[PDB]
Structures are given as C-alpha cells and as structure tokens.
Amino acid sequence: DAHKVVWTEGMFLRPHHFQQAENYLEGYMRNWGQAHSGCFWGFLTLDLDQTLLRQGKIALNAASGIMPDGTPFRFSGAQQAPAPLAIADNKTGENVVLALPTYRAGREDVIFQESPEALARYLAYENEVDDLNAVSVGSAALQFGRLRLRLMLESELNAEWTALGVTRVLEKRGDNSLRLDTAQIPPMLNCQGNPVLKTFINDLQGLLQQRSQQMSQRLLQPGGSSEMVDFMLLQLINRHLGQVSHAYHLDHLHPERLFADWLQFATELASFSAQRTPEGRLPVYDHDNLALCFGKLMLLLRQGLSVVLEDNAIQLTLVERSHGLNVATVQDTKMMRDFGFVLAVRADVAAEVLLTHFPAQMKIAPVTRIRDLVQLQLPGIGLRTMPVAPRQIPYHAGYTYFELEKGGDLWKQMEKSSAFALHLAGEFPGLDMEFWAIRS
Amino acid sequence: DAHKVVWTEGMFLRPHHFQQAENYLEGYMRNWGQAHSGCFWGFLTLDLDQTLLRQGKIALNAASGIMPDGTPFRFSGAQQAPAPLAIADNKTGENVVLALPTYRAGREDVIFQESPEALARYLAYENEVDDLNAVSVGSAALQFGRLRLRLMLESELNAEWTALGVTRVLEKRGDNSLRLDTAQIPPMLNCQGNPVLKTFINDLQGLLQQRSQQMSQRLLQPGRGGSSEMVDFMLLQLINRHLGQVSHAYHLDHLHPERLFADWLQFATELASFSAQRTPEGRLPVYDHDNLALCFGKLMLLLRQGLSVAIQLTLVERSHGLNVATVQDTKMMRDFGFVLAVRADVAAEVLLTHFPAQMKIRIRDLVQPGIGLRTMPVAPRQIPYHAGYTYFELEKWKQMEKSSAFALHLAGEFPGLDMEFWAIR
Amino acid sequence: DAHKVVWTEGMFLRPHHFQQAENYLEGYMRNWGQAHSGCFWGFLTLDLDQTLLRQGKIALNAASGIMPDGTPFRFSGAQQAPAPLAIADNKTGENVVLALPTYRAGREDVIFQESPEALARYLAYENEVDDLNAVSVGSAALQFGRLRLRLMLESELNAEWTALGVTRVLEKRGDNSLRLDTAQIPPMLNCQGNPVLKTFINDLQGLLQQRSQQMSQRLLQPGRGGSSEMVDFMLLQLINRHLGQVSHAYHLDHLHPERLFADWLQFATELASFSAQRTPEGRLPVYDHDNLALCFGKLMLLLRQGLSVVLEDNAIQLTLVERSHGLNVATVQDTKMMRDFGFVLAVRADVAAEVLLTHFPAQMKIAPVTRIRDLVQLQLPGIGLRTMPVAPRQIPYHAGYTYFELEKGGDLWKQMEKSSAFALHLAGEFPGLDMEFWAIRS
C-alpha cells in the first residue's frame, strides 16, 4: 500500500522521493482500474516464435497485457523480449508461463546487473534522450527500467511471481522440435488476439446462418404446435445472429462478456432438448482456463443447434375393430425402434385379478400376425408390470402400467409394422386402456 | 514506448528526468485504460457555439473527451478553447474535426510561442500557484502546458495527427453563414452527451410504449383468435423485454453507444422473425464508432420497420331503405371482410332472425334475396367496442368485386335503428 | 483544471512543481477512468466492526473503493481506519457516511496537525523507506500523505465533502449498543462485496432452479397441445435463459450492480407478459446507484410475483443441493425458520407404492450437517417422517407424489433449531427419485 509523498519547502530531494511517488501514482491507477474490471489481467497480443520452436525453445516475438498484480507490459523484438526458454529432452506435458516478480519493499526492486533468480522487477539500462522543450541545451543520458519478464515452467512458479499462461508443450521430439498444445488458450483481454477464440466466433456465426436459413425456408413452405416450436427456435437463433455479428466485427471484446452472452444462449437452448432444462453442472467462466470453459460451452451450443425438435412421449389412439380387438397406428417407420411402449389399464376387479388374468388374455402383435396368434393360441408380446406410472406419462390413479417387452422374433416383425394389434379375450368390468409411446 | 526512469543516489537532475517520467506514467495509464475499453476515444461533452456560426466560424464553447491516441482533454470558455476555424466559400461537403499532433520522439512537443506549422503538443504558459502545504512560504510562478487542440478540415489531416469528428458543413451560404449536417454524430463516449443519440433513445421508448399498449389491449379482450394470436403474444414478449432495456438506457447518466448498439442489433434481428422473411435478409449494420450516424441510422430503420402496423365506411342516406356504402378503393373489396354493427329498439331474438332476412345487399331488381349475413358471436376487436350491438359478417358474390359501392335496402321498421358498416383486412 | 508542468533547463525547483505535477497526473487518470465508467464511485469492500457497535460507535475494520470525486481509497486496521463515530443518545433513523473533503485550490490540502473542521485532504506523517535500487546508501525518512477519511452523519454534510453511504442507525438501545438497518445497501462497485446483493443472486438462482425443474417435468408429459401449453413453454424458455445469466452472476468474482440490474429489469418487464396486465404497469424501477435496496427491492418483488407458485409467503421452497451420493443439504434462510415453519418432503420414485411408504421413511435419515454421519454408521434414527394423507394446501400438489411431514419433537429437533441447514442422506435403491423440500409457515 503506497502512499502519497508530501513535498515541503526546504526539502532535500533524494531518490526515494521519486521512487515512492511513482509507487503511489501507479497504485492510484491500478486501484482505479481494478475497481472497474473484474478479469483485468492477460494478453492483448501475443506472438510466439514458430521458427525458434524447431530448436526446442519457446520464444515470444511480441506480447502485451497486464500481469496478475496489475502491471502492464508490452514488448516487440528479441532485444526487448524475455530470454527464450529451452525445454528438457525428457520433461513432458508441462505448462509454460510468462512471469514477473511480485513487488516487495523488503527486497530490492531495481538491479543493474542480471542475476539468475533475482527478484528485482527492473533491470537498469542507459539511453540518451532529447530534451522536450523548444528551448533547451542538448540531450542527456538517463537510466531506465526494463521489466524483468521471464519465461518459465508453471512448475517452477512460487509465491514471489505473477504469471500469465502462454502455452503447453506436449513433446520434444527426436529432432529437437517442440510439439505444442494448440488448444490451450491464454488469459486474454481481447478475443481478437487469440486464434482459437476468433474461430469459436466464426464457427458459431456459421452454425447460426446455416440453421437460420434451413428453418426460415421450411417455415416459409409448410400450423401445429410443431410449427410454433420451430418458430420459437428460429426466433432464438435470429437474436443471436445479431449478437454474434456484433462480436465478429468488434475490434476489442473481452472474453468474459462473450462467455456471458453465450452461456445464456446455451441454457435457453436447452429448452428444446428432450430434457427441456440444462442438465448437469453449467460451465463456469475461468479466465485462466478459457479452453476448458469455452470448450464445454461450445459443445452445448452445438448440441443445441443441432437438435431435432421432437416429442418425448405421445398417446397412441386405440381404434376398435372386431370385438375385443383394438389397433393403434404408429406415426412412422422409425417409431418402433426409437420408442418403448406402455399399456395403461384400469378395471373394476382386484389388482390380483388384473395382474393374473389381464396379461393372460391380452395378445399384442403386429396386425399381420394377430389372427395367427388367436387362431393358433400363442402368446403375443410380453407385458411387464411397472411398479408405478412412468414419469413421461400423466399419472392416472387406479391404472396399472405394463411395459411391452422387446426382443425376439415377434417383436422383430413389430419393428417392421405400422400398427399394433391388441386382441383381448373375455371382459373386465369398467375396463379402460391407454397406449403410450415413450422415447428411449 | 516510454520506460520507467531510474533514480539513483547521486543523480544530477535534468528536466529530461521529469519529462520522461511523466511520459512513462501517462503511458502506464493509457495502457491500463486501453487494455479494457474498446472504443475509448470520442466526446463526453461538446457545446459548439452558435453565436459564432453567423460568422463563418466553427467554435466550441466547451468539450471533454479522449483523443484517438489516448489523450484526455477538457476545456470550456473562450480562453481555453481552440482557435475557431473560419471557413471558405470554397468549401462544401467536408467534415470539421478537433485534432492533436501525435507524439514522436524526433520533435519538440513543448513550445513557448505559437506557430501553426509546429507539431508540438503543448504550448507553455505562465501561472502563479499557492503551496498546498499548511507549512508554506508562499506562492510560486510556474510554467504549465496547454494542449494545442486544432480545429481543422478533414482534408488537412495527415499521419501526424489524431482527430475527432466534430461536424461537417454542407453549405457556406451567401449570408456569410453555414448550414450544418445536424445528422452527423461525433464519436461519443456517452450517449447522453449528444442530442441525436438521445432522441434515438427517446423515440424508441415512445414507440415501444405505443406498440406495447396497442398489443396488450387487443390480447386482453376476447375475440375470435386465430394463428396470428400466438404470434402476437410472442411479439409482445419481445417488446416487453425492450421496454425495460430502453428504460434503463433512458435513465442512465452514462452509456457508451456501443453497448446501446449491441442491444438494439439483437433486437432488430430477433424482430425480423416477425417479418415475412422470418430471418434477417441482406447485410447487418456494423458498429462504427466514427460513423455513428450511419450505423445507428441503418439499425433505427430496421427497428421502425419491425415496429409498424379496420375502417368504417359511411352509410350515406339517399332514401329510406337505401344507403350507399361507397368503398373508397376497389382494391379494398376482396382482401377485406365487412361487418354490420346493428342495434334497434326491438327484441334481441327477432333482430337476430328477421333482420338477417329483411336486409339484403342490381339490387332494386332483387327487392321486387341478398348476401348471406352471419351472426358473429364475438365482435372482432378491430371494431371499437359497442355494447349492445349485434355483429353481422357479410358472406363471401362476384358482381361487386368489379363494382365500387354497397347498396343496403331494408324491409320496413325496426324502430330506433343504428347501424355501422366496417371493413377489416 | 490540473495542467501539465513545464520542466525547463535551469528552472529553480520548488515544492509546488511536484505538487501540481501530482495534481496533473491524478487528473489524467481520473479523466481516463471516469470517461469509461458510469457509477464509478462506491465500495469494493466494507467491513464494519460489530464489536464496537455495542458502544454507540460506528467503526470500519477495513474498506476500499472510490469516492464520488474520483478518489480511490483503501485501509485496514484501526491504525488506518477513520476515527470511530459516536452516535448520540437521540439520533435515530439517521444515515452514516464515509466522507472526504473536496479538493479546492483556495484551501490548503495537507496539514501536519490534526484538527477538527479542517478541509484538508491529507494528514502528513513520517516514515522511513529503503532505496529501491541496490546502489543504495541507506533508508531515508519521508513525509507521506494519508487520506483524511471520516465517518459522519448524512445531516452534517455540505458541498465541501463527497461521501459514500455506509449504514443507517435505527435505534440506540438502553445499553448504548446500536441496531443498524441491515436492509440498506451501500453504493457498491462489486456485488460480491455486499451480503445483501449476494443473497439476491443466490435467492433468484434457487427460484429459477425450482421453477425450471418443475415446469420441465410437466412439459415432458404430453399435454393438450393448446395455447396454454405454449405459454408455459414460452415461460420455461424465459426461465432457462436466466438460469445461465444468474449462474454467471453467481460465479463472477467481480460484478458491478448496474450490470446486474439492467439484466433483471429486462427479465421483469418481459415477465409482465405473463401477468394479468400483459405489460408493465406503473413506473418502471430505475437504477439508483446510491439507493440499491430501494431499486433492487422493487425488482426482486416483481420477479417473485412472476415466479411464485404459492400464496404470498405462506410457504417457501428449499433447494436440495446435492453434495455427495444420496446426501443433500437444504440450507434454511433463517434461524427463526425452524420454529415458525413446518417441513414436508414431496417424493416420487420408480418403486412400488408399498415399498415407498415403508422403505423411504426408514432409509431417509434427516439431521443437521454436523450431526449426520455418525447416525449413519451408528445406525440411529433421525428426524421422523410422517406420511400425510392429504397434501398441504400451501404448496403445489403433484398427483403421484407422496408427502411426508417431518415429525417435530424429541431432542434431535433442538439441534436442528439451532442449526442452519438440513442434511438428508438416503440409502439409495430408488430409481427415478424426484424430491421437493418445502417449509410451511404455521
């Protein structure tokens, strides 16, 4: 905590005065900045040297940003950059970072001669500079500070540094070339300065233009609920056409802002999943692991933008034919395989009667075999008693639920069929049945 | 790129030291600010002086903002104000700007006598100031730096300046005065700072309030319904969301135009769902901080389109039993339906049975039956509320798609009669 | 008007140069900062000393933020905090502020001797500091400046001060202790610096999780396919968007209140679509940085009205937060809650009814977090669960669920009463389990 210097008349100026006055004005600006920005550290720009990478070292041609302690930085050129960092010929799967010593008054801040692991924040160097006034006398030689930025392994870090993550090496091959994890993303203050973020945006805009035009075309060429639900999705997509177009053209865009919009998009999208609500832990923004959090977020977005809008459960209509014989037509070809089936049954007999006699007297089969089953006296599809109404169908007190058992040669003919045939022998007083299909 | 000045135990102090240290601090600030603000330059405030515009002279009474290079500034009054720019009868169609020289190390940016060709950033000047301490000896004359802010033509600009658009003269008239394109918008850091942006916000608010009351009123009342009904409720939700958004924008003391633009853009593109395309068509507007009039101009037109939406024809008397229903367009006659609002001092039951028969709509041929008239259980909500009336829909034939007016002729008496005739599309 | 200083060659140096130079630089940064932040003043952190509340004193342990005039500040410890403010016997319902005098060139800005009624911004003090270089000779003694922050009454303010609101004194008890209006919210720069804002977020999230769970389950079942089902689906959609929005808010380490308000206002005005009025009626709530309790208060109301499925506050749902396998934790939001409310578990599972009625009440052990685990290994009982033959009229009744009231009484109940959360562990043989935990006012 750096305080403001008092300057009195008759005061003898010492280097400390300026040193402390700099400390204070820096804290002043840092306090102002940190009070109004929540993820204030990371890279505005970062250019890693790809050629140097063949020689088993990580170099930075240029970079700019803010360190975790609030220190701003910017360097362009090998003379200005941190020492390249060589990688062991055995170490593997290590995170590399760009670190800087934390300020401390209990230790020297500026040094004039480099040192292995010295914690000074600056290195002194000399440079001639012009006076700035029109009237002047010549130039002057000053000493300046050079932030002691440093590339090192994450494992080498300790409480005396602040670091932005830069990359991760996965392999030092035989020929000394470095295999980087091109997926790890650094802390970024601007999505525009990282290529992965940029194509997250670019990719999403493409998904949205694509499904936007698929839908608008079909809604333009059919009035059911199915149509309304689709219009609702198109509406949600259309909102995010504008949003992501703005993100696509913006010169500066903090990733947190982008992530907030897209997380809302993803949870609203889950409305159209079969579950109707987000499932499991939501992605949480992590400014120092953007790759993990935008990765999960992008998966949800892609699932959501690829979902086919579909019913999870529907009631089939029993249509009466000959005495005791009902037929329920399946919607389409694929329903037989994508669904399970439950027969709900109410009757004014004891449950003991229902459970023993009803399955025995009901024969379910594809229409093509029901006559054979009755004429030859063979069972149909099996019925399994469910303990309680499933959750996808409405509870009706008094009803007993039976699940149709799949598998076997009879069920295989059912999968080729378009209608169930339910032929019941005898009678049950007050009998009522519902026939339900539930997605698997 | 300015670096930290190192101060050492015996050092001999040169103005260079202070000068360089100020640069390093200013650039430390600039670097923090620019790391976290995308469109960081523009005006917070701008008060051009009309009084000087009868004189062919663009002058600012006051301004505050940040230059495109990051330089903060603020001034008010004749003294601190940059020189007014007097303009030529030559000039028509050009932007005026407020500019500052860039800073390069290879030239002075303090000068002590003014000279238009100098690229110096500050003009030095004299002022005496008191000590801030309570243990003081007295005041002291110092030299301060005045920011050399230029009012110049955009054509005059070159790589050795940065500038902010201030306006753009379209006409230097014969009356030694100019007409300004009041539709041009400076780069703004706060929407409340510029009147065009403010009227943008106020006008979208009023229009959303209008459509909001418009749509809710219809949905509140019973009516026939139809496929549009659910769509109308969808659009009202969307409008209801933006009533809050725009109210917040309306009340904020500080709002950056980019934030406003990003919200309105998603609005416009969701809005397109309720247009015939079902999705936006063409190329979206793109936010341009230095051309706010164009981008917002486009967006605003998208919005007015999305937020845009029954007529009573006079039953003119010509005789008893016959009134003319001159439709004012033959176009009208096949896309609109037509309804008879009818009330008579007679029993409800008979007016529902007889009146459909003694009023048919070549006609006096038929008088010596007419178009089907169907009872309308619920009145359409587009017709204004009329308690106690019975509504009749004229059955949709084809003699009158080619004619131009209806002829109603009713058989005799239903005392105290009243009648309205409406067309709905 | 803090202009730049011209350092010429051969200039004679005086204190004034450095003084005006710090003015100029401070003004540079302040203009930068203020140009890009509305509502830039307030607290990031605020720690009131409760122990001193008991002597008629308002004292700040620590605080940080920005004053309305642009001045950042940070302090900690009684050595640096402002002098505590004694509240007189008669003040009641008065606002206490943190204040600082405004900079004026016509007045001295540094004083060396504390005095009352002096509008100086700084108080000079002596300290000694090492050289930051290694070419160092040794430490040097300097005079630093310390911000003259001060706690005072809102009524004692004038234009020579800016101030941030800290709290309101409602009553000075007989024993000279003070009771504060805990509902008032200081101007805040981070929602996470204030407990009341944090619980707004946490409450809204739990409501959205509750309505989301319930509505989705109803929409899973096929309905009539009419407009009423579409309305429901439209609302779950609106709830689902804000599940994500509030999750982000809940997890952000730093979030300015104005940003949160703008989102919630839009949420509210779109929710009015589902009200009888179909559109907002009356004056909309307006963000007020210096009265967040008021403006958020109105917003929270609208959102509770639009989302509640019970009458006023006859009942409150508790979120069962899963924290292990079979273990859930229902935090209660009050210490009074456990003496004024009944407690019910709405349960449904894919087991046989006779199994659910017998096994559930035995296999679900309910107790306080501290006292849970032993019971499981100790195989002792927990709070009893009584089947309810009619479901409460105060909470929604899902046909097909069974409702168990918690048996009150015993000694175990007392431990709960003084606890702040239920712990529930269940011997898990229950496919399809869905539960709701409700508290019902008596």
Nearest to A183 by CA among A201, A162, A199: A199
Residue C406 to residue C439: CA distance in whole angstroms:
10
Residue with tokens 């003319």: B324
For A232, the 3-state DSSP assignment is helix
How many C-beta neighbours within 10 Å does residue B307 have?
20
Q: What are phi and psi of B8, to 5 degrees?
A: -125, 165
Residue B225 sits in the same domain as residue B161? no
SS3 content of chain A, % helix, strand, coil (to 5): 35, 25, 40
To probe the interface with C, which of A16, A41, A114, A273 has the most C CB atoms within 10 Å? A16
Nearest to B272 by CA among A203, C237, A231: A231
Nearest by CB to residue C252, choosing from A38, A133, A229, is: A38
Residues 349-368 of A with CB under 8 A from C: none
Residue C214 sits in the same domain as residue C279? yes
Residue A411 to residue A378: CA distance in whole angstroms:
14
Judge whether A188 and A255 are in contact, CB under 8 Å.
yes
> Strand C110-111's sheet: what is its strand order?
A4-5, C140-147, C122-129, C110-111
Judge whether A406 and A341 are in contact, CB under 8 Å.
no
Nearest by CB to residue B129, choosing from C20, C33, C37, is: C20
User: Residue B363 corresponds to which tokens in the numbers above?
Assistant: 């006609």
Tell me the pairing of strands A94-101 and A161-172.
Answer: antiparallel
> Strand A400-404's sheet: what is its strand order?
A313-316, A432-439, A339-346, A400-404, A383-385
C100 touching A (Cβ < 8 Å): no
Residue B229 sits in the same domain as residue B169? no
DSSP assignment string, C99-116: EEEPP-TTS-SEESS--T
Minimal-distance CA residue of chain A relative to B134: A8
Minimal-distance CA residue of chain B relative to C119: B134
Task: Give strand pairing partners of A172.
Answer: A178
Residues of B in contact with C108 (CB under 8 A): 131-134, 136
How many C-beta neighbours within 10 Å does residue B402 have?
9
The minimum CA-CA distance between B11 and chain A, rounded to whole Å, is 8
Residue A124 to residue C112: CA distance in whole angstroms:
36
Judge whether A339 and A326 are in contact, CB under 8 Å.
no
B235 touching A (Cβ < 8 Å): no
Tell me the pairing of strands B94-101 and C421-426.
Answer: unpaired
User: Residue B155 corresponds to which tokens in the numbers above?
Assistant: 């054509």
Residue C196 sits in the same domain as residue C140? no
Q: What are phi and psi of C125, to 5 degrees?
A: -145, 160
Residues of C in contact with A112 (CB under 8 A): 133-135
Domain C-terminal end among A186, A207, A242: A186
Question: A259-268 burial, b if ≥16 CB within 10 A, otherwise e?
Answer: bbbbbbbbbb
Judge whether A67 and A149 are in contact, CB under 8 Å.
no
What ranges make up the beta strands (E) of A181-236? Answer: none
Geometric angle at alpha carbon B262, from B257 and B266, rounded to 5° = 145
Helices (H) and strands (E) in chain C, counts: 9, 22
Task: Give strand pairing partners of A384.
Answer: A403
Label residue B95 exposed, middle or buried (CB < 10 Å: 0-12, 13-18, 19+).
middle
Query: What angle, rounded to 10 degrees, do the helices at A255-269 and A225-249 form?
Result: 170
To probe the interface with B, which of A246, A253, A262 has the most B CB atoms within 10 Å? A246
Nearest by CB to residue A144, choosing from B5, B28, B108, is: B5
Residue A116 sits in the same domain as residue A126? yes
Element (H, E) at A96: strand A94-101
C266 touching A (Cβ < 8 Å): no
Question: A25-52 burial, b if ≥16 CB within 10 A, otherwise e?
Answer: bbbbbbbbbbbbbbbbbbbbbbebbeeb
Residue A43 to residue B230: CA distance in whole angstroms:
48
Residues of A in contact with C233 (CB under 8 A): 229, 232, 271
Residue A177 sits in the same domain as residue A198? no
- CB-based contacts of B349-357 (< 8 A; 24+ apart in sequence): B351/B390, B351/B414, B352/B390, B354/B414, B355/B390, B355/B392, B355/B410, B355/B414, B356/B392, B357/B411
A74 touching B (Cβ < 8 Å): yes
Residue B196 sits in the same domain as residue B284? yes
DSSP assignment string, A258-299: HHHHHHHHHHHHGGGSTTSS--SPPP---TT-HHHHHHHHHH
A322 touching B (Cβ < 8 Å): no
Query: Going by C-beta distance under 8 Å and a sequence separation of 6 or more, which residues neighbour residue B106?
Result: A130
> Domain total for chain C?
3
For B219, the 3-state DSSP assignment is helix
Dihedral sign, Cα of residue B387, residue B392, residue B393, residue B394: negative
Cβ–Cβ gap B129/C37 under 8 Å: no
Judge whether C93 and C169 are in contact, CB under 8 Å.
yes
The minimum CA-CA distance between C175 and chain A, rounded to whole Å, is 38
B14 touching A (Cβ < 8 Å): yes
Nearest by CB to residue B144, choosing from C3, C227, C287, is: C3
A215 touching B (Cβ < 8 Å): yes
List C-alpha distances in Å: A22 to A145, B142, B402, C145: 13, 22, 89, 14
Measured distance between the N- and C-terminal CA atoms of chain B, rounded to whole angstroms: 69
**Up-side HSE of residue B387: CA atoms within 13 Å toward CB?**
0
Residues of C in contact with B26 (CB under 8 A): 25, 28
Residue B180 sits in the same domain as residue B191? no
User: Residue B235 corresponds to which tokens in the numbers above?
Assistant: 């659009």
Cβ–Cβ gap B216/C286 under 8 Å: no
The minimum CA-CA distance between C275 and chain B, rounded to whole Å, is 11
A228 touching C (Cβ < 8 Å): yes
Phi-psi region of C176 (alpha: psi -120 to 50; beta: other; left: phi over 0): left
Label residue B221 exposed, middle or buried (CB < 10 Å: 0-12, 13-18, 19+).
exposed
Judge whether B3 and A73 are in contact, CB under 8 Å.
no
Minimal-distance CA residue of chain A relative to C24: A25
Tell me the pairing of strands C402-406 and A139-147.
Answer: unpaired
Residue with tokens 């979206």: B284
Q: Which technique was the structure solved with, according to the deposited record?
A: X-ray
Nearest by CB to residue A38, choosing from C130, C216, C255, is: C255
List C-alpha distances in Å: C158 to B24, C152, C162: 38, 12, 8
User: Residue A214 corresponds to which tokens in the numbers above?
Assistant: 């698929």
Residues of B in contact with A67 (CB under 8 A): none
What residues make up the domain containing B368?
Answer: 310-425
A12 touching C (Cβ < 8 Å): no
Residue A371 sits in the same domain as residue A331? yes
> Strand C42-48's sheet: what is its strand order?
C42-48, C60-66, C72-76
Judge whether A62 and A33 are in contact, CB under 8 Å.
no
Judge whether A230 and A309 are in contact, CB under 8 Å.
yes
Residue C345 to residue A165: CA distance in whole angstroms:
48
Which chains does chain B touch, 3 or more C-beta pairs < 8 A? Answer: A, C
Judge whether B129 and B142 are in contact, CB under 8 Å.
yes
Residue A24 sits in the same domain as residue A170? yes
Residues of B in contact with C136 (CB under 8 A): 9
Dihedral sign, Cα of residue C53, residue C58, residue C59, residue C62: positive
The minimum CA-CA distance between C30 and chain B, rounded to whole Å, is 10
Residue C287 sits in the same domain as residue C167? no
Residues of B in contact with C279 (CB under 8 A): 212-213, 215-216, 236, 240, 243
C88 touching B (Cβ < 8 Å): no
Nearest by CB to residue B5, choosing from A142, A239, A251, is: A142
Minimal-distance CA residue of chain B relative to A129: B16
Judge whether B81 and B69 are in contact, CB under 8 Å.
no
Q: Max Cα separation, chain C?
A: 100
A340 touching C (Cβ < 8 Å): no
Residue A217 to residue A274: CA distance in whole angstroms:
24
What ranges make up the beta strands (E) of C369-431? Answer: 385-387, 402-406, 421-426
Nearest to C146 by CA among C57, C87, C83: C83
Residue A277 to residue A17: CA distance in whole angstroms:
61
Task: Give strand pairing partners of A144.
Answer: A125, B5
Cβ–Cβ gap C278/B242 under 8 Å: no
Task: Give strand pairing partners of A145.
Answer: A124
Residue B324 sits in the same domain as residue B305? no
What ranges make up the beta strands (E) of A161-316? Answer: 161-172, 178-180, 313-316
Element (H, E) at A384: strand A383-385
Task: Give strand pairing partners of B133.
Answer: C110
Domain C-terminal end among A308, A333, A362: A308
User: Residue A88 corresponds to which tokens in the numbers above?
Assistant: 């062991």
Residue A82 to residue A332: CA distance in whole angstroms:
66
Residue C209 to residue C28: CA distance in whole angstroms:
46
C32 touching B (Cβ < 8 Å): yes
DSSP assignment string, B263-280: HHHHHHHHHGGGSTTSS-
Residue A434 to residue C221: CA distance in whole angstroms:
14
Residues 103-162 of C with CB under 8 A from B: 105, 108-112, 120, 124, 131, 133, 135-137
Nearest to C189 by CA among C255, C100, C260: C255
Nearest by CB to residue C134, choosing from A111, A224, A388, is: A111
C237 touching B (Cβ < 8 Å): no
The minimum CA-CA distance between C4 and chain A, rounded to whole Å, is 13
Nearest by CB to residue B286, choosing from A8, A32, A249, is: A249
Residue A291 to residue A296: CA distance in whole angstroms:
9
Task: Report the amino acid identity of residue C42.
Answer: G
Judge whether A9 and B139 are in contact, CB under 8 Å.
no
A30 touching B (Cβ < 8 Å): yes
DSSP assignment string, C217-276: HHHHS----SHHHHHHHHHHHHHHHHHHHHHHHHH-S---HHHHHHHHHHHHHHHGGGST
Minimal-distance CA residue of chain C relative to B236: C273
The minimum CA-CA distance between B8 and chain A, rounded to whole Å, is 6
Residues of C in contact with B144 (CB under 8 A): 3-6, 20
Nearest by CB to residue C248, choosing from A228, A260, A315, is: A260
Geometric angle at alpha carbon B327, from B336 and B311, rounded to 5° = 55
Can you give the C-alpha Rg of chain C in angstroms? 29
Cβ–Cβ gap C278/B219 under 8 Å: yes
Residues of C in contact with B255 (CB under 8 A): 38
User: Residue B68 corresponds to which tokens in the numbers above?
Assistant: 């495109």
Q: What are phi and psi of C44, to 5 degrees?
A: -85, -40
